[PDB]
Amino acid sequence: VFPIPX
């Protein structure tokens, strides 16, 4: 989930 790579 942006900004999270996963």
PDB file of all heavy atoms in Angstrom:
ATOM      1  N   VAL A   1       0.841  -1.188   0.000  1.00  0.00           N
ATOM      2  CA  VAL A   1       0.000   0.000   0.000  1.00  0.00           C
ATOM      3  C   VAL A   1       0.886   1.252   0.000  1.00  0.00           C
ATOM      4  O   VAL A   1       1.729   1.391   0.880  1.00  0.00           O
ATOM      5  CB  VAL A   1      -0.935   0.017   1.229  1.00  0.00           C
ATOM      6  CG1 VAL A   1      -1.830   1.248   1.174  1.00  0.00           C
ATOM      7  CG2 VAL A   1      -0.105   0.054   2.501  1.00  0.00           C
ATOM      8  N   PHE A   2       0.739   2.152  -0.990  1.00  0.00           N
ATOM      9  CA  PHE A   2       1.625   3.326  -1.005  1.00  0.00           C
ATOM     10  C   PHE A   2       1.494   4.124   0.293  1.00  0.00           C
ATOM     11  O   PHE A   2       0.400   4.251   0.843  1.00  0.00           O
ATOM     12  CB  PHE A   2       1.344   4.231  -2.215  1.00  0.00           C
ATOM     13  CG  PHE A   2       2.559   4.497  -3.058  1.00  0.00           C
ATOM     14  CD1 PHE A   2       3.043   3.527  -3.920  1.00  0.00           C
ATOM     15  CD2 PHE A   2       3.213   5.718  -2.993  1.00  0.00           C
ATOM     16  CE1 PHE A   2       4.158   3.767  -4.701  1.00  0.00           C
ATOM     17  CE2 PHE A   2       4.329   5.964  -3.771  1.00  0.00           C
ATOM     18  CZ  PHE A   2       4.801   4.987  -4.627  1.00  0.00           C
ATOM     19  N   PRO A   3       2.615   4.671   0.809  1.00  0.00           N
ATOM     20  CA  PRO A   3       3.941   4.555   0.202  1.00  0.00           C
ATOM     21  C   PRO A   3       4.689   3.290   0.631  1.00  0.00           C
ATOM     22  O   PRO A   3       5.894   3.170   0.408  1.00  0.00           O
ATOM     23  CB  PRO A   3       4.678   5.805   0.715  1.00  0.00           C
ATOM     24  CG  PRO A   3       3.769   6.452   1.722  1.00  0.00           C
ATOM     25  CD  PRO A   3       2.678   5.465   2.033  1.00  0.00           C
ATOM     26  N   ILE A   4       3.974   2.350   1.240  1.00  0.00           N
ATOM     27  CA  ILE A   4       4.577   1.100   1.692  1.00  0.00           C
ATOM     28  C   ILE A   4       4.740   0.121   0.521  1.00  0.00           C
ATOM     29  O   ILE A   4       3.764  -0.230  -0.142  1.00  0.00           O
ATOM     30  CB  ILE A   4       3.731   0.451   2.816  1.00  0.00           C
ATOM     31  CG1 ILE A   4       4.127   1.034   4.173  1.00  0.00           C
ATOM     32  CG2 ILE A   4       3.884  -1.065   2.827  1.00  0.00           C
ATOM     33  CD1 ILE A   4       5.573   0.779   4.538  1.00  0.00           C
ATOM     34  N   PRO A   5       5.982  -0.327   0.247  1.00  0.00           N
ATOM     35  CA  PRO A   5       6.267  -1.259  -0.855  1.00  0.00           C
ATOM     36  C   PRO A   5       5.489  -2.566  -0.750  1.00  0.00           C
ATOM     37  O   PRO A   5       4.916  -3.037  -1.732  1.00  0.00           O
ATOM     38  CB  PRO A   5       7.770  -1.529  -0.728  1.00  0.00           C
ATOM     39  CG  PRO A   5       8.305  -0.371   0.040  1.00  0.00           C
ATOM     40  CD  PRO A   5       7.208   0.046   0.976  1.00  0.00           C
ATOM     41  N   UNK A   6       5.479  -3.152   0.443  1.00  0.00           N
ATOM     42  CA  UNK A   6       4.777  -4.416   0.680  1.00  0.00           C
ATOM     43  C   UNK A   6       0.447  -2.337  -0.561  1.00  0.00           C
ATOM     44  O   UNK A   6      -0.642  -2.490  -1.111  1.00  0.00           O
ATOM     45  CB  UNK A   6       4.773  -4.794   2.176  1.00  0.00           C
TER      46      UNK A   6
END
